[PDB]
């Protein structure tokens, strides 16, 4: 009876997205920027749309290693670009320092970094469904949900030969949900819009007749 609570139901930490720097091979750029998308996986998306308005603090962790699952010591800079501030142009761009961009310097050898993001939205809660136009690409888009981009880079000075994979985990604390919504039957087409395929799929799997059971 305590596992039906909305607080426990959203509890556990999960994989929000996998990003890669890849500075070694044909792509030498040497950093990456990962806009925070909680909807990333269609499984995590279908449990969120259950509720229309929800207010929660997030907590992150970055599990990193090379392509060998081998983790030698080499330094990484995890920066958090808050919503409304400019993004880094290139691996040396002066945005990588500033002041106001909170950063985390962690070697690979260390156990994974961890950090806690507060509630960033202007409105008193997030909205997963916003009717009406922000001011037809525009229809139903919340401008106020952006949580920031978590730009990453490897401090070591020039062109290491090592592509560094990294995984990003999220978990939701202190969650509070408002008016409920029925779960989605139809498959998803694209990320930001509900649009569903022409051909409809039934909700229940058919049987022989209105009568026969099993």
């Amino acid at each position: 009876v305590n596992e039906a609570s909305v607080e426990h139901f959203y509890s556990r930490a999960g994989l929000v997205g996998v990003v890669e720097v890849k500075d070694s091979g044909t792509s030498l750029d040497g950093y990456t920027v990962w806009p925070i998308d909680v909807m990333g996986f269609v499984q995590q998306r279908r449990k969120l749309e259950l509720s229309t308005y929800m207010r929660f603090d997030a907590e992150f962790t970055f599990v990193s290693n090379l392509s060998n699952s081998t983790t030698p010591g080499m330094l990484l800079q995890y920066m958090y670009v808050p919503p409304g501030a400019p993004k880094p142009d290139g691996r040396k761009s002066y945005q990588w320092q500033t002041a106001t961009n909170p950063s985390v310097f962690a070697k690979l050898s260390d156990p994974p970094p961890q950090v806690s993001v507060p509630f960033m939205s202007p409105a008193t809660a997030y909205q997963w469904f916003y009717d009406g136009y922000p001011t037809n690409l525009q229809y139903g888009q919340c401008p106020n949900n952006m949580m920031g981009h978590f730009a990453i880079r490897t401090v070591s000075e020039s062109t290491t030969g090592k592509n560094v994979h990294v995984r990003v985990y999220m978990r939701i604390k202190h969650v509070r949900a408002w008016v409920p919504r029925p779960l989605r039957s139809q498959a998803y087409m694209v990320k930001n819009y509900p649009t569903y395929s022409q051909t409809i799929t039934n909700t229940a799997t058919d049987r022989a007749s209105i009568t026969t059971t099993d």
Partner: antibody
Amino acid sequence: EVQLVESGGGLVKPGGSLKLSCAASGFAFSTYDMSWVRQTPEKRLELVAHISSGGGYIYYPDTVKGRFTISRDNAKNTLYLQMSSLKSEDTAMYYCTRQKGLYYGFDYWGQGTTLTVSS
Amino acid sequence: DIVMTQSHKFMSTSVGDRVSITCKASQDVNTAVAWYQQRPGQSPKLLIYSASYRYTGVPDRFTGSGSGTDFTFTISSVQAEDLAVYYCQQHYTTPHTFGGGTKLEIKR
């Protein structure tokens, strides 16, 4: 397809200053780093200056450091090079190139313009 | 800085032949290197960058290989259009640096 043109190059006397301006068309011009490269009469090539795509980072070699200045305008699709106090060795032809980052190779090269420092 | 020196200021060959040029690094550059094609009176084109990989559109007869401080740029089959000066680059660190140049010779 793509066009990199330059201007301003020409004979000049020592000490003077001259603005080489590069103009581009056929691609999105704010998404690419840019650079200048000069080719000595011996055809020895060397770097001149570098700027990031959005103006974040600007790099100068030790020789031209403080003597030149580079800037770009994403609205005009131009790349400007302000260069002063020209010595003897500053004569060579200057190419206007394009990159996708710091360490990528230079894919395009302007037709190049000469520069000459003499009495 | 870090100097990239090329062994031969000139090399000779003929059409259909096979020629391969080296490049030598002042210190360890890892795999970062690039090879350029400068035809007479023309803006030097990009061919092969970062050891083996070659830029989009470069014909397949152009190959390269190496690692560390010792590099090689291999032409499977020489043609007429292949006459020009070649250069090797170091993009491993700033500032970038170019080799002294190498000029082919087709002797008929």
